C-alpha cells in the first residue's frame, strides 16, 4: 500500500460515501475490471464524455470519477502521468483532465503548480456535469478550478500553500501570462 508523493493515503483521499457509490456502480464492475494504465486510456477514449463527480438524481458516479479512483488504486508513476498529460492530453483532452485531476490529488503543491499551470493556455471545450445541472466548461477553467478551489468532482482537494509563499521560498518562479504582458500596456 504505497503512499502518494504528498502525505495523503490514496484510500482515504475520496470520501467513504463516494468510494461506496463508485464500487457499487455498474460502470466500475463492468468497465474498471482488469484495467491497467493503457486500459485506463482505453476507457477514457471510449466512455468519458464529461468531467464530474457523482451526478444526477441517482447520484451516479461519473466514468471520469471511477477512472480517477482506479488511478488512485493503480498509483501510476510520474512517467505514465506525463504520457497521459502530454501525449494523451494532446490527443485526448479528457485524458489530460483526468491526469490533472489525479496530479492535483496526489502530488506536492510545487509539482501541482509547475505541472498544471501550463494548461491554462489549453482552451479546448469540455463537458462539465454536476452542480447547477449540465454546462460547458474549458480545460483552463478546469485547471483553474483545480488550483483555486477546495472541492472538485465530489472530491475534497487538500489545502495547498499559496503560490506567493512558494515563490518567496524560491520553490517557484513567477507565473507569466501572455495576457499579463498585454494587460500591463492596457492599464497604462
Amino acid at each position: 500500500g504505497p503512499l502518494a508523493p504528498n502525505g495523503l493515503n490514496p484510500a482515504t483521499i475520496m470520501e467513504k460515501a463516494v468510494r461506496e457509490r463508485i464500487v457499487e456502480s455498474y460502470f466500475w464492475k463492468e468497465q474498471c475490471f482488469g484495467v491497467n494504465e493503457a486500459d485506463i486510456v482505453d476507457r477514457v477514449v471510449e466512455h468519458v464524455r464529461f468531467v464530474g463527480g457523482v451526478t444526477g438524481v441517482t447520484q451516479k458516479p461519473s466514468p471520469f470519477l471511477c477512472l480517477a479512483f482506479k488511478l488512485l488504486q493503480l498509483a501510476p508513476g510520474d512517467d505514465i502521468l506525463k504520457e497521459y498529460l502530454y501525449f494523451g492530453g494532446e490527443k485526448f483532452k479528457y485524458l489530460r483532465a483526468l491526469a490533472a485531476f489525479y496530479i492535483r490529488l496526489t502530488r506536492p503543491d510545487k509539482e501541482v503548480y509547475t505541472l498544471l499551470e501550463p494548461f491554462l493556455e489549453d482552451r479546448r471545450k469540455l463537458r462539465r456535469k454536476g452542480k447547477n445541472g449540465t454546462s460547458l466548461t474549458y480545460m483552463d477553467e478546469f485547471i483553474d478550478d483545480l488550483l483555486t478551489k477546495d472541492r472538485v468532482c465530489s472530491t475534497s482537494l487538500w489545502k495547498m500553500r499559496r503560490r506567493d509563499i512558494l515563490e518567496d521560498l524560491d520553490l517557484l518562479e513567477p507565473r507569466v501570462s501572455p495576457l499579463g504582458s498585454l494587460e500591463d500596456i492596457l492599464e497604462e
Binding site: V35, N36, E83, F87
Partner: protein
C-alpha cells in the same frame, strides 16, 4: 490471476494505437 502493470512505452503505444483507430473510423464514416 494478477494484472500486469503497464510501462510508459506501452501506454504510449496504446495512445498511438487508439489515435490511429479513431482516425481510421473517421475515414470509414466519411467513405461510407
Amino acid at each position: 490471476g494478477e494484472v500486469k502493470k503497464a510501462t510508459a512505452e506501452e501506454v504510449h503505444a496504446r495512445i498511438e494505437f487508439l489515435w490511429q483507430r479513431e482516425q481510421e473510423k473517421k475515414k470509414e464514416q466519411v467513405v461510407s
